[PDB]
Paper text:
Two other orthologues, ArSqgA from Arthrobacter sp. U41 and CrSqgA from Cryobacterium sp. Crystals of FlSqgA and ArSqgA were grown in the presence of NAD+ (or a ternary complex of ArSqgA with citrate and NAD+) and diffracted to 2.35 and 2.65 (or 1.95) Å, respectively. Clear, contiguous density was seen in both structures within a cleft between the two domains that allowed modeling of a single molecule of NAD+ bound in an extended conformation in each monomer with its nicotinamide ring projecting into a polar pocket.
Here, we identify an alternative approach to sulfoquinovoside hydrolysis that is adopted by these organisms and discover a family of SQases belonging to a new glycoside hydrolase family (GH188). The SqgA proteins adopt a two-domain fold with an N-terminal dinucleotide binding Rossmann domain and a C-terminal α/β dimerization domain. The structures reveal homodimers, consistent with molar mass analysis using size-exclusion chromatography-multiangle laser light scattering in solution.
Numbering used by the authors:
A (entry chain A), B (entry chain B): 9 to 372
The structure:
């Protein structure tokens, strides 16, 4: 072993996944949980399965001395404030902070300065990359099987935003926008696969279908439910994101395609069985499509049954935690830094502005 | 029966497909072929299989008195000139004119005026819609199985521009640009499926891979080989086109998806036999993906063996000619008018400007 005491700031749905995944990793002990909602604590405690000290407020937790490391899985607009507390705390602990790291540019601007002066690891929890199918595509791109890389397409086709606590995931004011909230993953993936930095974004999107029967003090959701985004990079590579939140019918929730000048590669990621028909479970597919001699190659990508049953992310949360652990113990780097978190968000924020004011947006 | 005498102005590769398809349609007689290149004439005649009168120049053909209707399958920048001759000819005849109808805005502007004062049918040969797979998508969109329609995605993944006669298809000056030349069909498809008009268009693209090694008086092809295009419509529907001319590896050359608020529908078009592996004759698929009860429905869509062997367009050219026949006999409408042809071109021209400038462009 070699034990790490973990504290959870925020004890909702994703917290419980972090729990189930920490359960598979020896050396991992949860010792403190913070949540302003007792019903959330009761359920999260039940899931953990052992005795832990609870707090309604994270400040009491920070100075409790029960924890070697933190996990933040509270609503998006809370994230910066909690971090500012962690940064100004005497103790100075590692943090895994759920995405989005930020929800506005004011925050991004502020966070950027503070994080520079902090001495403990900060990892932004964008796990998508450790999905085994996506891992293949990343190594295939990086290692040269595609030749020189130019195009990258991501298509997400999925169900409407789920029902959460105090319905915080309904308004842009609280989420950063659909493209920040659900899409910072894909904007980071772009940077990772293309090995490049964005120069420009343009998007078209609407709120066309969803959440039209929900009032919250008389108001309907102001958020996007579909969009097309186009990103240009400093070397002239280009990428595109397509989103529909009313395409749950799709066997495959994500489709990721990368074209280079020697070959093309695509992956098809199924819907989580927890969201699909029971029995009609599908396995993920990767297709390698070379130009040079015509002859595409398809193959299923399997994971571990336990790791996959640990969450709704095809085992990725597990690996994410293996990474975080290593970094705490100085046996690996932070793979997903604040910087990364901030680019992913500024990318979404830019995209949101573009839909609003019918112009592209420059990135710095 | 009722026999129709057809004249072909231009006798290259597509002309021979027009021939092969006219061969399947009873009542179709070719009587005159025009081409400045006798190599082209002798092969096109060989294909026809019977005796016909040839001309080097289309003007002699127009006043030959052998023809009830015309087909234009010459290089793009010739198209307006030939039409001006047809429009001013004493005997005013029906015309099927290959796409692009135009190559510049000056021409679009001019053609628009002239074609209004011409009294014979003018049909722009964008046959894509009659591909049986695509037909299902259009009826499904129009007829309501998708609910209200919002998104349309087109992915073309194909080979570099081919070697043509006197190599006319290499410079923007002669083609109108890649987005005009090879993409006007998809811009028309958008208008057709969405049943709407574009308000705005934006694209990112480059010349990144292809034709770095053909010189024409010392100069390299100045044409795009990949792009992402985004179109917004007057009702808030949107569409996006992805093009790579270096993705010949792809089993499926086209992928079309349409998302509405009850269901999604996709079609996959294989590479034409003549361009694919020998033996690997894959068929097109259509997948219906409802939201309401999860349960996707897939099925292969066949074309007739002869109709499929008659062309490189999944049988579409045949149906196109069934329509053109009716219009010649004044028993049927022009399904694809000059107006349609002109929007398709202006859409590409707009997209070309957008890549160049860096801003979206307004459409009227
Ligand atoms: N990594 C991923 O794949 C992924 C997936 C979904 C959600 N998330 C992120 O997880 C976070 C929310 O988790 P969820 O989706 O389970 O939502 P949830 O509503 O189920 O959980 C949020 C919890 O935070 C509590 N809370 C509210 N305000 C708080 C505060 N100021 N401090 C601490 N806790 C507070 C709520 O009472 C609730 O118990 C968001 O940042 C969201 O973006 C990440
Ligand atoms: N699916 C489609 O709709 C499709 C497919 C292929 C080509 N096309 C169109 O067909 C045209 C090109 O035909 P192709 O691809 O078979 O090319 P090609 O180069 O193989 O044949 C073109 C022929 O036109 C002749 N020609 C040149 N100048 C002429 C003139 N002034 N008058 C008459 N004939 C002339 C050439 O000598 C040659 O014989 C273009 O407009 C192209 O966009 C359409």
């Amino acid at each position: 072993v070699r034990t790490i005491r973990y504290g959870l700031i925020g004890a909702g749905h994703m917290a419980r996944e972090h729990v189930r995944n920490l359960a598979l990793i020896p050396g991992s002990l949860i010792t403190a949980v913070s949540d302003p909602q007792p019903s959330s604590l009761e359920e999260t405690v039940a899931e953990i399965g052992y005795e832990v000290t609870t707090f309604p407020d994270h400040r009491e937790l920070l100075v409790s001395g029960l924890v070697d490391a933190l996990v933040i899985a509270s609503p998006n607009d809370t994230h910066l404030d909690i971090l500012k507390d962690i940064f100004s705390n005497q103790m100075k602990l590692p943090v895994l902070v759920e995405k989005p790291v930020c929800t506005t540019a004011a925050q991004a601007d502020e966070l950027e300065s503070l994080a520079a002066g902090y001495s403990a690891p900060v990892w932004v929890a964008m796990e998508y990359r450790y999905m085994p199918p996506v891992q293949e595509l990343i190594q295939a791109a990086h290692g040269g099987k595609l030749g020189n890389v130019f195009m990258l397409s991501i298509v997400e086709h999925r169900f409407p935003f789920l029902h959460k606590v105090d319905a915080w995931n309904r308004f842009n004011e609280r989420t950063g926008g659909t493209l920040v909230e659900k899409c910072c993953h894909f904007f980071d993936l772009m940077r990772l696969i293309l090995q490049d930095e964005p120069t420009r974004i343009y998007a078209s999107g609407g709120h066309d279908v969803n959440h039209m029967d929900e009032l919250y003090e008389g108001r309907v959701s102001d958020m996007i439910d579909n969009a097309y985004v186009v990103v240009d990079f400093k070397s002239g590579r280009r990428a595109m994101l397509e989103l529909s939140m009313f395409a749950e019918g799709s066997k495959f929730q994500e489709r990721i395609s990368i074209v280079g000048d020697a070959a093309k590669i695509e992956c098809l990621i199924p819907v989580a069985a927890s969201h699909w028909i029971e029995g009609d479970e599908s396995e993920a597919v990767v297709e390698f499509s070379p130009r040079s001699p015509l002859g595409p190659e398809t193959h299923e990508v399997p994971v571990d049954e336990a790791v996959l049953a640990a969450g709704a992310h095809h085992g990725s949360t597990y690996y994410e935690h293996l990474g975080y652990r290593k970094a705490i113990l100085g046996e690996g780097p932070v793979e997903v830094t604040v910087a990364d978190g901030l680019q992913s968000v500024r990318m979404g924020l830019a995209a949101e502005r573009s839909i609003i004011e019918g112009r592209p947006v420059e990135l710095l």
